[PDB]
């Protein structure tokens, strides 16, 4: 009944990709991006933008979707959504390309933002928040954000249902999906979530006093012991929301012919998770991961080994990768070693790649925006706990960068490992944001930087190409203004 | 068996959308660009470009293709092709989109150039040239170009046959399809083709001494009578090709389960056609038309009415639209009123729109490159024999552009006529070129721009935004250089 | 669109040839072999052989094919395939002969083995397995063998679709087409198929306990009931295949403009079929058949009456012909009356010839290899359930032979029933097997051998002619080695 | 209207294939035999043989025919004639293989013997004699042999016209075409013909006293001058014909829509040509040849330079190749250096292969029967004036053989020169003779007989394979008795 995949993929899809205990994680590096076919539509109107891609790689199919903001790129503006389910396919020449069996376009009045999608046996499942108001008004709204549920089936038809926000979220002021891909666990699909908590509610006094700190590396926070505790605490209550607690949430909805059956929220204790934020839930073989965005003071990409028992989820000590960082505010940037209360950053997810014999994780792959402050210079690299492998530049100079979601799959019949980072980059004319399906293969560092590098750089015309701007580097300044987030 | 269309589109597809004798031509007009899902793939590759698009609209379905060069944008260079078939559907809100049902992506060792495609009952029929050598090299090859005739089934599987060139094209040095595709007439499909002839052959001796001169409205050439003839003659033997005679053609193949069954080559007298160049065969109502790109002296768009009998065709003097002009090299430019030997211009196709009570053609639609010299500033307006209506600018400033293909259909249920224009635009990052399906509706001028006019301009970052360059206007020099062509 | 046949043949093909309840079956006999123009190519290489023919006769055309080993005659080795489609034609003198209208010779890199063909409304459909490995290697290969469905269209062109085995054959370790061809029925083509099953697979569990014993006429096995059952049961798991069950299978594809569309795999109960082997799917008048080779304990020829309902055929207790035998290894040879586990014999099909008044089958014709043990002495003859007619020998003495596939038809104009056997015969120089189409007319014994009898024997030089060898009759020993096989 | 060929050959048919004044003639040698698809029919009847192949290759098509005896191999026996025309094609992988485009098999009461065939502009033009009587009975028949003009057209049908022999042949007792085909020149065809002459008739009294002595090589003839002159003369009155003069003659008919129009008989002087016999007419490029069979005392092959003026041909002093010999009766064998009155030999023709800059012949190709006395050991080799290159053996040991006609062509695209030898070889079962399309590629001797030889030999089973015969070499006797001719 399900589309499944092509002959060559089955067996290498959604499983531990690389296990070697003799080799080093950094010995694995990405090749130059490979030519394939685009399943991601391109902007027609030169007015509004399109951003926020979501991807989940099933053993069977794949699910992807993004949001289209009709006019202006502003968060709250009236928006559409394009969801697409598909299947890997290999051409007559045996080249790799993603294929879309069924897509959908929602043009209606109702709004959807931070739609996350996961792959489940029944179809494409996505959890969207319905926004009739803006960010500020919603935190001012004691009524949980109207949330819904939908499934794109292999039949192509789309059926939706509106979950009960009041009951589920009664302790929540605002509720949004973690924007990232979820995954299918024990016959119920799980999505990450984040949001603010009502003052003095059952769930708020629950995380009260709870906090945690994770250091970066060799260099350690120069602040005193009792000083590290304070900043870590108030982080959960940023000024943006005026002393509201943003908690990390995890939603578990059973996958059944009945849409939205037995919704169950699972909140990890704050002695584990940092300030609530958007992210992605991953399952590699028997392993389960919850990816948290760097919205907090901590730059290095985080993967929380997670488990599920009795409809509820457990979170353990997060996997950190130091070379893999993200841009953010002044208090919280790629170089920040201390705790603080701030709002900045961006979504870039590592997808588990390299593993040990005991099956524990060691190093991964990611498409990172390489920079300290503004969101810039997309770069693809393979990571371990400490540093990252040789990289591949999306373009020379620096180019406008945004949310990136990476996924790695294996081709059994060719015995070759592939990774697809779905990325947002400056679209210039046509609305400033065009998401691209980049394709790459992991290689082995053993051999004879052969003097021919197509991964060295790539050509961006938006900075260069007539006038050389002006070289006193208010350009850096004008660039850092050129970067728009949230 | 066939997909047909939505119940909405049936009845308004491929016909005369507007017939009024009491309406002035320029009094209709395009809308601002409408929002729709893009059915056209975007470059993954950060190396080569994506060029030479083609389109046809069947009473049932649509057929489209575009060629992808793997290294650089050069004409001869090795390239994959991408073809697809799709339908016209209406979403839940009644919105207008074009869905691709089945697409094929050609990765093989065969290098296909200038591919013409038509929508046919049995599927998508495509005429392509496989090219072993470069342009000059093949005009040095007394051997006619090698070609193919394929069809993409509704079943998704794509078949191809190599048609016999040595027999059929025998008098030709080189033979190329006309890009934008011919159409389905009388249980056989007809494609546009141009190319070089074997000097003093059967055909070369046929078009010898034959010519025709086409003047411009209200503007007459100051040159002497004999002179004009002397030129116009030499128009068919341009310098680039060395005394050889460049000829126009249309190819008729009988649509059948077998591919390429019974090829018949229709060669018109030059007493009618200008220097052979690329084009399109269009069918609207009972009306057949053949577009010729303006690749020699005559700028105004040319629609040659066409009759069909005995597997061959016959041409009659073209419908001249003096409102519709293309850029070109200095000798033949949007302005030029005299005959001149030259090779320049671009493919911009007029689509028949308004007709009289006697069934003759009145006005047409299209996107034109607005400029005298090079390819720049695409625009979409309505035209009659002389002037042109209020336009819709695809960009403010001026940006690099290319071939554009316009097509107009009617939505019967809502009784709303729409126009699709597929244009190529400088893509900067990702290979300099991208093929966009622009959307436009036909509206009535009668009324009161409201002092809003969002259709006026569209932003472009290519040229401006860090520097503005050097107003010294050597800018226009490099902007002219930013144009890439054949 | 069809080529059909010559008007003299029309009405005699694919029907019941003889109905007399009054005449004795064995009163009908083959003439002496007839002179006709041979449509089956003969070897060029003085190295590899050419073996394994398959033939099916449409009411319009015919379809024949054979594999060719490029070097050596060994099964696994690289093999071309020649497929032809042709027609019955009558010369000026009315002399019957077979004509090839179009042909395709597949020399490519894909290995096609055990190829079956069938005459269908669209052309020549055929079903081949492509083999990467030796049979040995593939019964260990948990993966089912790749198969392809090609068709040669009257247009002369040839197209392939490799059907997707992982899903269709999923319960099979290896899978092969039944050599001798299938027939076109109910707007879908049906093929003979065999292979091994995965232990404890849905199919395997389905056949567990299932078996049948077929007994020889007038000769009954002395072995006690228990024993026979045990032996019989073992027949399905010969030790050559290592205790995997060897299963007979029928394959149906719906013949359509799309090759290999909507396959359905019909696995009969072993409560009926014997051990899996090659075969032929026959259609005679309103009746249908499945020929099964004698590859296990049961010597006589087998036709299974086959009813077709719901794309899945059904089978019934088989017609047997007790004097139509096949050579076999000691446990299972011409004379074998008991059940035993073995793999032997040769493909020689009966073609239903004579019928009763109720349309049931009464007797058949065909070419049998006449000897108890090895492959030797081809003889053509008419058979009934019990014994056989006056015969005709392809040669005096005893010649190495192989598969035979016979087909009988009637020329109504003259009212003369004829029969074609395509036979595998030793070729001496040129590769040891030459596939030849012998031709014969059927006759009523009522009449007067006139003391002429040119049908008695034919001269073979491969045994005699400079020496006569050594009468010690170790000749027999060597002669039995002159036979090669599978 | 002709079929032409596949585009890859054009320009490689009927021209000087090899011109190097630097290379040694014997440095060009044949390949091992090549795998291809056999276009010549294979025997069905196990009684009568199939003999006497003729061939001519025009740049458009080819023409081949052969005779089929019904019972026994005896010349005069009633026999069918097969004629077919075809077109060189290359496969998917570019393999050379011939194809029969059209064929007719003549079963009528007429007998066509010693049939020659020439590919012309209008089709396959063949010339046969219709034989009522035996060879004896005919040369005692004062009346000239009835002959005929057939043609096989592209439309597929075949017409025939009997030319007036009484008027044309008046001076002859008997007349037959030269077997191997002649070729078309200047809007009229030319055939090889030999036969007898009425005593004291104009043609006979002309050739009286005219004779030619051709000396082999460094081995000369010791007999004195008168003894030689006298035998050289006797050479034209062999006993077989009883003092009737055997003459060589060339037949020229006009090639038109009306068969038999304007026949002309050119008879060259005996001061040039040896005793008359079967032969071939070869137009290679700008030159013309005639191959006289070795039917007389001259062992080496013979190519007479042949010029044409006034519809009547003319010959010149012949090209001798001493290496390329033929077997015959005792007085005239491979080794005969002197003149003699005898009748033997066989048709094995040289095909012009290597040339000089002045367009004079240097060496040829051919398949020769290598032996002094009887017809045995087919071998392919490249010859020059004196010696021969490395050779290809159609088999090991000594296999019964017969006429060989051969022609060489080039494949332009791949630029490779091939050669086709059509040759008669012992068939054992199924008729004692089989005509086979033997294929080869010519090679450069430059290189290193690499220690891997498949051309070394080939395997025949008719001498060997049980009993080793008996070694006293009455075997050579029984062998030389296993060869039958004429
Ligand atoms: C699986 O094996 C790996 C390799 O030994 C373990 O990795 C070590 O973990 C310890 C404990 O944290 C560290 O002190 C070492 O630095 C790690 N070594 C390396 C090379 O990474 C890992 O702990 C094991 N996993 C489990 C669950 O036992
Ligand atoms: C169809 O109607 C149109 C519009 O009246 C005709 O076009 C006119 O043709 C006449 C005669 O050649 C010209 O004098 C006018 O200048 C044309 N008018 C325009 C606006 O182009 C056309 O002739 C009619 N078709 C036929 C075949 O009679
Ligand atoms: C079809 O006809 C055949 C021949 O008449 C029938 O076969 C006979 O069946 C009867 C009844 O069992 C037996 O007594 C005879 O021995 C059979 N004859 C032969 C030659 O086998 C057959 O029964 C008929 N089919 C049906 C369904 O009745
Ligand atoms: C097969 O036949 C049965 C009985 O008519 C019918 O119910 C069923 O629908 C058929 N199967 C298919 C797939 O059409």
Numbering used by the authors:
A (entry chain D), B (entry chain C), C (entry chain A), D (entry chain B): 124 to 571, 578 to 615
Sentences from the paper on this structure:
HN protein binds to the receptor (sialic acid) for virus attachment to cells and plays additional roles in the virus life cycle including F activation, and receptor-destroying (neuraminidase) activity to facilitate virus budding. HNs are type II membrane proteins, with N-terminal transmembrane domains followed by a stalk region and a large C-terminal globular head domain. Certain avirulent strains of NDV, such as NDV Ulster, express a longer HN protein with a C-terminal segment that must be proteolytically cleaved to fully activate the protein. Proteolytic cleavage of the C-terminal extension in HN0 removes 42 residues, leading to increases in neuraminidase and hemadsorption activities that are necessary for the viral life cycle.
The purified NA domain protein crystallized in space group P3121 and diffracted X-rays to 3.5 Å resolution. Four copies of the NA domains are located in the crystallographic asymmetric unit, arranged as an apparent dimer-of-dimers, reminiscent of other HN structures. The C-terminal extension wraps around the external surfaces of the HN dimer-of-dimers. The extra C-terminal residues adopt a mostly extended conformation beginning near the bottom of the β-propeller structure, traversing the NA dimer interface, rising above the NA domain and inserting C-terminal residues in the HN catalytic site. The Ulster HN C-terminal extension inactivates the NA domain catalytic site through three potential mechanisms. Second, an active site variable loop (the D198 loop) shifts into an inactive conformation, further inhibiting NA binding and catalytic activities. In the Ulster HN structure, we observe that residues E584-K587 in the C-terminal extension directly engage the second sialic acid binding site, indicating that this would be sterically blocked in HN0. The C-termini are stabilized by an interchain disulfide bond formed by C596 and mutagenesis of this residue releases the inhibition of neuraminidase and hemadsorption activities.
